[PDB]
Design a protein around this ligand. Structure first.
Ligand SMILES: Nc1nc2c(c(=O)[nH]1)N[C@@H](CNc1ccc(C(=O)N[C@@H](CCC(=O)O)C(=O)O)cc1)CN2
Ligand SMILES: Nc1nc2c(c(=O)[nH]1)N[C@@H](CNc1ccc(C(=O)N[C@@H](CCC(=O)O)C(=O)O)cc1)CN2
Lengths: 454, 460
């Protein structure tokens, strides 16, 4: 009969990389929220120059974790130190496999004693649920999936609404809503604020700003209050088209491949994951090609989570991470793509004589799979890194990507990103026929700041 | 107190053009349907090379018109001849004002005796509703609005679902669903077909438009996609969908020519203050302080052949007085690909004070009425470009325009792309500078035309 878990899918599908690079899943969608409210350029501009409302209600998985062993479950599975962790502090939860590779990540809120909520993409939520169900933990779990990618006019519901108020004028909007001064608490500390007489819990995700959430039913009331108060300061809502491009400027890589496709110690997990999970059904896109799925894995140090690793508690993969030498690991950078090469990519769309054009680079977000992997090359043609999230900033007037590259490459080095896939493109439904191009890219800081080439 | 009709809005709103060109309404949205199912390039390609399912359920107003005087109401307001019109034939309804200017258009289905339904944009439905109410007609009307632009996850409902199966393999898919041979009905005649045991009414567009009660939408959709998989049929999302008309030649967006004239004052005093006409937007480079310079008459947008003086109709006297031979003509403008490359290159220029107006793909409109000036080599306004985007099938940017009648096919003109002084206050407009784009006058529906050279560029 047909598979019911990921292990059976892999045992049937041939080479794992070939299966994922030709998946028919289609685009990774940021659902439900209007694609644009004004236009994505003005919306990008506003978060740097005035204020914005980000609507985060629909594109992330929420996992509510309650019970006596809830903290134990988190401690056992995260690289992060649990020491001194008290309610009203959030952490960027990063779990690794027994082999030291990143499964995923999200934000875990310590809400009350024995009460936590994870927010992020599916993979780290899947890992938490597996260990909660099979590891003998005394916990209760409520899974609230991200909203359907194409709801078709059907109704949509979540447990909570989730917004951010950001931009240089964000604190003015927040204080106007609050009705008084509000202390700028420390990064990732949680407090509360008033909105139209409601007690609204907050998270410092600062130009300071806040993330706020509440029961789904008060979404419109909260939203209307924020937009009305924000008008004086030029606050505008951001649509789903501009929304995900924000991370190109801030430097968080959303899309590491869940490193769970190989390894005897991960087999029981592969047998637990359903055949229609994110991990079985998703796609890999881009120019980086290897026949071994392990070559797509990253460890925490390679994508900026090195400083989170704390060998002060027992956790899955701790021995693997202790054996890593942090000083030689690849490092997360921003690649600043050459504007002349970008013009050449778009020009090929309007070339009526050419046999092929370069891969369409959508704006402001150019990803065409849920895991992105473009090869980064030096001037000799060696593969020196992997570019993992790609798009464009109207603030910078530059195409940008987030990448992990060999540690010895200095800031300001001109590399190339291989943009597009081989042999006319894979069979992904996001991929039109196209030829590859080497794009020149200057290694830049993360978060992005402008860098001289030299 | 909020106003309740358009005349109040105009009397308080300053210059009418300035009001409409700075409207805060935002984008003209094709709502509800997923923006993409595969990607818009493959979707465009499939309607010329395999088969597609267009989903038309949500972006048009439906106006059902029933009763003894239903046909008389249509005949009294359309330029079209009613002769030979009987149930199971559709027409492209085109009403003009008493001054001979186009209000709008859409398809009217003659469903049965005394039973009609109009499908299209709001303006012609509004006009029909006004005359149904004030003209002394024995008719009942049911208005079913297009879906909200941003439903916010709230549920949506229409009276009917409405699809098209199109492309070179469309009839193969149609017959596989039918269970046998199906006759190629004549253009715009209506019949029926089988879909999953249901009797589905059809309209000939070489493919079909089909419709049915809203509750059977997913049953119909699933059967179409399942049967079409054999022939490479795929669904088209809302991003690619509206660019189809760039290739086929229909201008969707004439300005409803109702803003001036004493004979239209009573209509303005009835139109709601939040109507399409009151709240919408005009975008583009064509600038005049006189709203009437944005009006078109039916000859200018391809509807000249529809005008028949065999019946009484609003605007008959005005249209009689027009010389069809001296009127502007509908064409396709093929935009120069090097000028397009330059438009997109400016987005990646970190040093320029300004960039050219963003050209979204595959549809570039940023208002519900579009009006870009078309210029000759001397800079005379010789036309108006009215719908703009790009075809992956042609690897070309295209616009639909109406231009001076004497301008030959193959002539190179320019379209002024973008707005003046950094751009209007429309929420779709980022700061930008204008660019003159070279464009070759081509036939409609579009076909590739060789450029024709003149002494120092075509002028006059
Ligand atoms: N609900 C919520 N969940 C989320 C996101 C969100 O937006 N809100 N966005 C994603 C997480 N993105 C980031 C980006 C940056 C940081 C960050 O800045 N972390 C600190 C360390 C945090 C810690 O001490 O644990 C640092 O110094 O890098 C954290 C999550 C996924 N899940
Ligand atoms: N439901 C439905 N309604 C619609 C559209 C649709 O897609 N389906 N699309 C829009 C109308 N578009 C066209 C395009 C071409 C023609 C057309 O081809 N007309 C014939 C004449 C038809 C007649 O005899 O009156 C001609 O010779 O030009 C008609 C409507 C709006 N209304």
């Amino acid at each position: 009969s047909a598979p019911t878990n990921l292990e059976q899918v892999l045992a049937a599908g041939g080479n794992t990389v070939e299966m994922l690079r030709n998946s028919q899943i289609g685009a990774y969608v940021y659902p439900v929220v209007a694609p644009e409210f004004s236009n994505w350029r003005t919306e990008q501009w506003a978060w740097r120059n005035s204020a914005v409302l980000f609507d985060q209600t629909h594109h992330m998985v929420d996992l509510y974790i309650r019970g006596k062993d809830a903290l134990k479950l988190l401690s056992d599975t995260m690289i992060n130190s649990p020491k001194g962790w008290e309610p009203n502090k959030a952490k960027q939860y990063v779990p690794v496999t027994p082999y030291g590779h990143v499964i995923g990540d999200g934000i875990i809120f310590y809400l009350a004693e024995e009460e936590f909520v994870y927010v992020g993409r599916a993979p780290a939520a899947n890992w938490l649920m597996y260990h909660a169900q099979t590891g003998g933990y005394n916990v209760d779990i409520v899974h609230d999936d991200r909203s359907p990618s194409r709801p078709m006019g059907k109704p949509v519901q979540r447990i909570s609404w989730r917004f951010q108020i950001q931009g240089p004028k964000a604190w003015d909007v927040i204080e106007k809503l609050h009705g008084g001064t509000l202390e700028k608490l420390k990064f990732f500390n949680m407090a509360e604020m008033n909105i139209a007489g409601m007690k609204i819990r907050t998270l410092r995700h600062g130009a300071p700003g806040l993330e706020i959430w509440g029961p789904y039913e008060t979404q419109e009331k909260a939203r209307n209050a924020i937009l009305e108060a924000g008008k004086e300061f030029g606050l505008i809502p951001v649509g789903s088209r501009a929304y995900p491009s924000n991370t190109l400027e801030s430097g968080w890589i959303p899309s590491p491949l869940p490193a769970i496709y190989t390894g005897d110690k991960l087999k029981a997990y592969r047998e637990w994951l359903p055949a229609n999970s994110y991990e079985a059904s998703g796609a890999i896109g881009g120019s980086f090609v290897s026949s071994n799925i392990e070559d797509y894995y990253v460890n925490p140090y390679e994508i900026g989570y090195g400083p989170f690793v704390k060998f002060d508690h027992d956790f899955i993969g701790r021995d693997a991470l202790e054996a890593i030498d942090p000083a030689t690991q690849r490092k997360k950078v921003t690649l600043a793509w050459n504007g002349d090469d970008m013009a050449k990519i778009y020009a090929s769309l309007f070339d009526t004589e050419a046999d092929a054009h370069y891969k369409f680079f959508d704006l402001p977000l150019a990803n065409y799979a849920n895991t992105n992997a473009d090869a980064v090359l030096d001037a000799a043609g060696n593969v020196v890194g992997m570019s993992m999230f790609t798009g464009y900033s109207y603030n910078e007037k530059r195409a940008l990507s987030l990448a992990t590259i060999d540690h010895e490459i200095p800031v300001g080095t001109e590399l190339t990103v291989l943009w597009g896939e081989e042999n006319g493109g894979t069979r992904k439904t996001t991929v039109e026929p196209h030829k590859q191009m080497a794009v020149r890219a200057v290694v830049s800081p993360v978060p992005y700041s402008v860098t001289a080439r030299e």
